[PDB]
RNA sequence: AUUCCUUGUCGGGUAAGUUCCGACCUGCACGAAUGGCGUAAUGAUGGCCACGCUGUCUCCACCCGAGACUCAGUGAAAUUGAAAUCGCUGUGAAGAUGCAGUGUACCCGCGGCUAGACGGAAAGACCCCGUGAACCUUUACUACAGCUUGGCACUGAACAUUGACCCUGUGUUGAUGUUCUAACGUUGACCCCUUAUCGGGGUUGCGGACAGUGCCUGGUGGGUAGUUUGACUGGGGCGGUCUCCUCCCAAAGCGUAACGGAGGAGCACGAAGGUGGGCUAAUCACGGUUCGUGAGGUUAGUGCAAUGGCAUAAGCCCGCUUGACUGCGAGAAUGACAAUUCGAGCAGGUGCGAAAGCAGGUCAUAGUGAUCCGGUGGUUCUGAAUGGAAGGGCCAUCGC
RNA sequence: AUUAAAAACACAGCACUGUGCAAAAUCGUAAGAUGACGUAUACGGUGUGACGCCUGCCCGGUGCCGGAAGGUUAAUUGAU
RNA sequence: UAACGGGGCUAAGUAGUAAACCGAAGCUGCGGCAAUACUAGUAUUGGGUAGGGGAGCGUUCUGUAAGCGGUUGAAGGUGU
RNA sequence: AACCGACUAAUGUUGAAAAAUUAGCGGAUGACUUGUGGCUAGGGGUGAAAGGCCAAUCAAACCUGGAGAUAGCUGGUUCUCCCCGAAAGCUAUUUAGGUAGCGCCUCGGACGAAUACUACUGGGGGUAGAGCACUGUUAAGGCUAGGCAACCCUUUGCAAACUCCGAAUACCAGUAAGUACUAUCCGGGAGACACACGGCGGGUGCUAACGUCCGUCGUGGAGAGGGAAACAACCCAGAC
RNA sequence: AAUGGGUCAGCGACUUAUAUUCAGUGGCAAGGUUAACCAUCUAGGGGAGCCGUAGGGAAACCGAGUCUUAACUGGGCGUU
RNA sequence: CAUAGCAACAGGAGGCGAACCGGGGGAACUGAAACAUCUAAGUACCCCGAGGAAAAGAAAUCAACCGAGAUUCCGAAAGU
């Protein structure tokens, strides 16, 4: 059949020219105790490390 | 995506964003593609006829990629400042 | 028939990260330490965790200085 | 086990920006509502902020 | 010490099924 | 038929009795219909004793038959990597026909025996493991049947009492009780279909808006069903442990295991944070109803473990404060990754300081929890005819 | 049935309990059945187990039975 | 026997000195093959499980093939 | 006695027999036994109750179908040559005999000395050793507060969690020669994540174990040849 | 002295479809390619579509830039 | 009275068949590396009813301010 996309992966990993882009973890709750520095630096989306990519690509066959 | 039962990467990382509906019926057009259009008027129908946009497209942005060598009147579509310049430089108009 | 022990923390990878003579860029962490085992000398800042880092480009120099004979990390202009 | 008793609070800008800092207090040591000058980023000014719940 | 083993099935040949 | 210690102790029986019988009572851990204690008779019932009896035995002997053995005919079987298939000592995946050394040994049957071939047989039933199975249990979880509760329907009428509401006593509804009959019930009687203890119809009696059933609903619910019931582990269980910090093990960079040796954390603090100014311990000696002087030199202190630090104190006191700032961030540290750490400098706005300056919490290293779902505020980015809105997003934050 | 014949099961007797007859109970979605062409001296369940002497204390728990005052509480209703 | 591998040894033991020799798939010699570099020759290289990579053999079937071989003997079988 | 049964023993156990025979044994007018025909059916029946029996089968019959259930387990996996060649680790895991990323292998591409070895130079050490200055611990004597003896003094030892000291090595960096297709980066493909012994440094254990857990190096694994009688893991040495 | 095989002969295990990706090879090339279907049917029609030709951003949207922020000395990703 | 009932007569039907079709009922293993939502799957299976096909079908449909014009089947949009 046609490969199905893992919609979990799709909703968390977006392909750009610069690689698979993702939202950092640990910015959902329990933030009072965290530093504004730490919270600030997590706010920008990031590109996945090389080791994380192969899987994601197998989960995102059309992306 | 299975990692031996450790919380996988596709779950330890948060979901983010949404899809606009407009995105699904929008299409960028390169300035070089405007060559393929037959006739002066570059509109949604003429783009569709040239197969430059699919028939479900509703909103088009022309972008500065390549060169325009003919005078075209772009009606109805959005153009980039750079593309506008290039259109106007090749004796085109940008209608509203 | 058991041990009250068992426990230990994760090793904190402390120590000299750039030794004497090493060329460092401004910002480069030189020493990671607990307290001032090494003090900050010229062109060296000290973080909240007493991390010594290069304020300027140059070469790391260790040096005993002062009446207490304390060790100092400096960046030498080179 | 958890021994933590300091209540979390939201300090809210005295400007109507609705910007809030969060923190915690010992409710015994500080019965009243906490007030403290803090930079509000929306109005880009240091203004009084006052305690509120959550 | 000697711990009495269970080396064989409780039903013995020729019936052992 | 219960007693662990235990062969309890005493008595009987025997030459000698862990059994038996009687009895004692410190009943580990009898006990009154899961009956207690008796009890004639009964039992292919359990225990023990005696007489008789004996090849049960001392300890076998002989004999009669059926096999075994031989001839003639028929003709299986499990098993089987291949075999030119010895002993011993040693070696060796650790119990050797097969290796080493050595000793012994002409080739081949037949009758016998079973020490070895870890002989044959059955992919160990023991034990463990598998995020296997089954069936069983229950105050494991989640359901369901059944049972049951109320609402509504099928389901109506009069009054009487009463509640609410309505107006000006009056209606409109709601209960509650009585009465009633016309729905409904009848597994009462009689008639007919009809030669029928079914059924239907008719008549009548007794009930009667009850019962009963449907839908909804609470309860009950091992009756039934689907399932879950962690891992490490010097087998497994039991116990202990599971994350984080400090030291040691750790072999003078980093890192480094054990159910190795030792301790701590799961916070605190609106000052115990920022900054300016100031200050400097412990403990003794000696004199005084804490005080003074000297010695001493941090042996003190550090909100809380340990370690590394700390006098320019990071320790101690005070004034003023909110930098326990918002956006960012050269450049590094450290991780499989998620994440974690340090950071000059820039912009904005700020506090302390005369000023250079210092300040993005705290001497530092523990004080913690991904994602999903959802909550609150903001933004007004999206939002399916359009305009809104809901709902998404983004930002802040809360809920393990 | 084919490694257990027994001290196990049953048993007469005993007791508790349910059951008023369209009985309880059971089989069945239901109709219909059994119960029973029986009717509390009957029928069902539970335990005990000829017979003799007897069968103590405890109703906190958990059942079951009864009581309803109050508290809590569903559908429903729909005030604000 | 069974604690030199045995025979056996008073050196065939132990320590030492001198000069020999034996001893491997090590090195060398001679012949050959291969991989990879270089410029056919050089140089290096060629133990190997899991595994990766490279190059082939043979089988059946289709085309080539109404061609080619075959009762003057095909396939198969069995020798050389 | 028949008949029904099945208490003991022996035989038999590739039987005469998938439960019997022989000698004995129990019931034998009863809750008896037997023939024929009926009925009850699988979470169902039936059970004087053994989880017994329901066609030599039963803690859920048998047949067919779903169905090639699923099987992180075991077995097995078929021609030839050439080149290279692991791992038995870390991290995580209802994970521990599985799996994932990383480490290690291979193939392609990029890149080219940035790499390895050595000399020299610059570093930080707190280990071995040693020492007793600290913290502990220890002996003798002195001196003496105190009530025999602190505290000090002299002498004398001990330390993984003591240090006034302090190597060799190792590591980091630089400079430089020579040797080497090294290092690095991006892709395709893996396998492995049970390790073993030996040396050295240790923990644990008895400085027991062919014990156990780490560090590091070697060999085995995946390695033939010679030696060590025989002997994976020792010695020598790498088989076109 | 762990497993399996008494022997022989025969048969007996990485497939097929579809999709994604990487590589080799060929065609064409800033283009490449058609699907169903039609068809006098391996031709030829058929341009729906897909991939490439632009990225950034959650998004609107902007666009060789964009996102972040009040704004970056900036910084992320991209440009070539 | 009538109706029920009863009889006569006429016309139908019944059973079988591999699949396809519409409808009534409807699992579980399995996957989720456990499992209950979920999956498997409205599948298997049982039943009923067809027909040469069946079903569906002629907008109280879409669309988006432009428009389209029943149903069915096939290619894309899109693993969006």
Coordinates of N, CA and C (backbone and C1' of nucleotides) in Angstrom, one line a residue, chain J residues 27-61:
Chain J
rG27 P 21.6 7.9 -22.7 O5' 20.1 8.3 -22.6 C5' 19.2 7.7 -23.7 C4' 17.9 8.4 -23.5 C3' 17.8 9.9 -23.5 O3' 17.7 10.5 -24.7 C1' 16.5 9.0 -21.7
rC28 P 18.5 11.8 -25.1 O5' 17.7 12.9 -24.4 C5' 16.4 13.2 -24.9 C4' 15.6 14.0 -23.9 C3' 16.2 15.2 -23.3 O3' 16.1 16.3 -24.3 C1' 15.5 14.0 -21.5
rA29 P 17.2 17.5 -24.2 O5' 17.1 18.2 -22.8 C5' 15.9 18.9 -22.4 C4' 16.0 19.2 -20.9 C3' 17.2 20.2 -20.5 O3' 16.9 21.5 -20.8 C1' 17.0 18.4 -19.0
rA30 P 17.9 22.7 -20.7 O5' 17.8 23.2 -19.2 C5' 17.1 24.5 -18.8 C4' 15.8 24.1 -18.2 C3' 14.9 25.3 -17.8 O3' 13.5 25.0 -17.9 C1' 15.3 23.9 -15.9
rG31 P 12.7 25.1 -19.3 O5' 13.2 23.7 -20.1 C5' 12.4 22.5 -20.0 C4' 13.0 21.6 -19.0 C3' 12.3 20.2 -19.0 O3' 12.8 19.5 -20.1 C1' 12.7 21.0 -16.8
rG32 P 11.9 18.4 -20.8 O5' 11.7 17.3 -19.7 C5' 12.9 16.6 -19.3 C4' 12.5 15.6 -18.2 C3' 11.2 14.8 -18.4 O3' 11.5 13.7 -19.3 C1' 11.1 15.7 -16.3
rU33 P 10.5 13.2 -20.4 O5' 9.3 12.8 -19.4 C5' 9.5 11.5 -18.7 C4' 8.3 11.3 -17.8 C3' 6.9 11.3 -18.4 O3' 6.6 10.0 -18.9 C1' 6.9 12.7 -16.5
rU34 P 6.2 9.7 -20.5 O5' 4.8 10.3 -20.6 C5' 3.7 9.5 -20.3 C4' 3.2 9.9 -18.9 C3' 1.9 9.2 -18.5 O3' 2.2 7.9 -18.1 C1' 1.9 11.5 -17.8
rA35 P 1.0 6.7 -18.3 O5' 0.0 7.1 -17.2 C5' 0.2 6.7 -15.9 C4' -1.1 6.8 -15.0 C3' -2.4 6.3 -15.6 O3' -2.5 4.9 -15.5 C1' -2.7 8.5 -14.7
rA36 P -3.1 4.0 -16.7 O5' -4.6 4.2 -16.5 C5' -5.3 3.7 -15.3 C4' -6.6 4.4 -15.1 C3' -7.6 4.3 -16.3 O3' -8.4 3.1 -16.2 C1' -7.4 6.5 -15.7
rC37 P -8.6 2.1 -17.4 O5' -9.2 3.0 -18.6 C5' -10.5 3.7 -18.4 C4' -10.6 4.8 -19.3 C3' -10.5 4.5 -20.8 O3' -11.7 4.1 -21.3 C1' -9.1 6.4 -20.3
rC38 P -11.7 3.1 -22.6 O5' -11.2 4.0 -23.7 C5' -12.1 5.0 -24.2 C4' -11.4 5.9 -25.2 C3' -10.9 5.1 -26.5 O3' -12.0 4.9 -27.4 C1' -9.2 6.5 -25.7
rA39 P -12.0 3.6 -28.3 O5' -10.6 3.6 -29.1 C5' -10.3 4.6 -30.1 C4' -8.9 4.4 -30.5 C3' -8.5 3.0 -30.9 O3' -8.8 2.8 -32.3 C1' -6.9 3.9 -29.5
rU40 P -9.6 1.5 -32.7 O5' -8.3 0.5 -32.8 C5' -8.3 -0.7 -33.7 C4' -7.4 -0.4 -34.9 C3' -6.0 0.1 -34.5 O3' -5.2 -1.1 -34.2 C1' -6.8 1.3 -36.4
rC41 P -3.7 -1.0 -33.7 O5' -3.9 -0.3 -32.3 C5' -2.8 0.4 -31.7 C4' -2.5 -0.3 -30.3 C3' -2.4 -1.8 -30.3 O3' -1.3 -2.2 -29.5 C1' -4.2 -1.1 -28.9
rU42 P 0.2 -2.2 -30.1 O5' 1.1 -2.1 -28.8 C5' 0.8 -1.2 -27.7 C4' 2.0 -0.9 -26.9 C3' 3.2 -0.3 -27.6 O3' 3.9 0.5 -26.7 C1' 3.8 -2.4 -26.6
rA43 P 3.5 2.0 -26.5 O5' 3.4 2.6 -28.0 C5' 4.6 2.6 -28.8 C4' 4.3 3.1 -30.1 C3' 3.8 4.6 -30.1 O3' 4.8 5.5 -30.1 C1' 2.4 3.2 -31.5
rG44 P 4.8 6.8 -29.2 O5' 3.4 7.3 -29.7 C5' 3.3 7.9 -31.0 C4' 1.9 8.4 -31.2 C3' 1.3 9.2 -30.2 O3' 1.9 10.5 -30.2 C1' -0.2 7.6 -30.9
rG45 P 1.5 11.6 -29.1 O5' 0.0 11.7 -29.5 C5' -0.8 12.5 -28.7 C4' -2.3 12.2 -28.9 C3' -3.1 12.6 -27.7 O3' -3.6 13.9 -27.9 C1' -3.5 10.4 -28.2
rG46 P -3.1 15.0 -26.8 O5' -3.8 14.4 -25.5 C5' -5.2 14.2 -25.5 C4' -5.6 13.5 -24.2 C3' -5.0 14.1 -23.0 O3' -5.8 15.2 -22.5 C1' -4.8 11.8 -22.9
rG47 P -5.3 16.7 -22.6 O5' -4.2 16.8 -21.4 C5' -4.7 16.5 -20.1 C4' -3.9 17.3 -19.0 C3' -3.5 18.7 -19.4 O3' -3.8 19.6 -18.3 C1' -1.6 17.4 -18.8
rA48 P -5.3 20.1 -18.0 O5' -5.8 19.0 -17.0 C5' -5.0 18.8 -15.8 C4' -5.8 17.9 -14.8 C3' -5.1 17.7 -13.5 O3' -5.5 18.7 -12.7 C1' -5.8 15.6 -14.4
rG49 P -4.3 19.7 -12.1 O5' -3.3 18.7 -11.4 C5' -3.7 18.0 -10.2 C4' -3.0 16.7 -10.1 C3' -1.5 16.7 -9.7 O3' -1.5 16.9 -8.3 C1' -1.8 15.3 -11.5
rC50 P -0.3 17.8 -7.6 O5' 0.9 16.8 -7.7 C5' 0.8 15.5 -7.1 C4' 2.0 14.7 -7.4 C3' 3.3 15.5 -7.3 O3' 3.7 15.5 -5.9 C1' 3.3 14.4 -9.3
rC51 P 4.4 16.8 -5.3 O5' 5.9 16.6 -6.0 C5' 6.7 15.5 -5.6 C4' 7.9 15.5 -6.4 C3' 8.6 16.8 -6.5 O3' 9.4 17.0 -5.3 C1' 8.5 15.9 -8.7
rG52 P 9.8 18.5 -4.8 O5' 10.7 19.0 -6.1 C5' 11.9 18.4 -6.3 C4' 12.6 19.1 -7.5 C3' 12.6 20.7 -7.4 O3' 13.7 21.2 -6.6 C1' 12.0 19.9 -9.6
rU53 P 13.5 22.5 -5.7 O5' 13.4 23.5 -6.9 C5' 14.5 23.8 -7.7 C4' 14.1 24.8 -8.8 C3' 13.4 26.0 -8.2 O3' 14.4 26.8 -7.6 C1' 12.3 25.3 -10.1
rA54 P 14.0 28.2 -6.8 O5' 14.3 27.8 -5.3 C5' 13.6 26.8 -4.6 C4' 13.5 27.2 -3.2 C3' 12.0 27.1 -2.7 O3' 12.0 27.0 -1.3 C1' 12.6 29.3 -2.7
rG55 P 12.2 25.6 -0.5 O5' 12.9 26.2 0.7 C5' 14.2 26.8 0.6 C4' 14.2 28.1 1.3 C3' 13.5 28.1 2.7 O3' 14.4 27.5 3.7 C1' 13.0 30.0 1.5
rG56 P 13.8 27.0 5.1 O5' 13.2 28.4 5.7 C5' 14.1 29.2 6.4 C4' 13.3 30.4 7.0 C3' 12.2 30.1 7.9 O3' 12.7 29.9 9.2 C1' 11.5 31.7 6.4
rG57 P 12.0 28.8 10.2 O5' 10.6 29.5 10.5 C5' 10.6 30.5 11.5 C4' 9.2 31.1 11.4 C3' 8.1 30.2 11.8 O3' 8.0 30.0 13.2 C1' 7.6 31.5 9.8
rA58 P 7.8 28.6 13.8 O5' 6.4 28.2 13.1 C5' 5.8 26.9 13.3 C4' 4.3 26.9 13.3 C3' 3.6 27.7 12.3 O3' 3.3 27.0 11.2 C1' 2.7 28.2 14.4
rA59 P 3.5 27.6 9.7 O5' 2.3 28.7 9.8 C5' 1.0 28.2 9.7 C4' 0.0 29.3 9.9 C3' 0.1 30.5 8.9 O3' -0.8 30.3 7.8 C1' 0.2 31.3 11.1
rA60 P -0.5 30.9 6.4 O5' -1.1 32.3 6.7 C5' -2.5 32.5 6.6 C4' -2.8 33.9 7.0 C3' -2.2 35.0 6.1 O3' -3.0 35.4 5.1 C1' -1.6 35.4 8.4
rC61 P -2.5 35.3 3.6 O5' -1.3 36.3 3.3 C5' -1.3 37.6 4.0 C4' 0.1 37.8 4.6 C3' 1.3 37.9 3.6 O3' 1.3 39.2 3.0 C1' 1.9 36.6 5.5

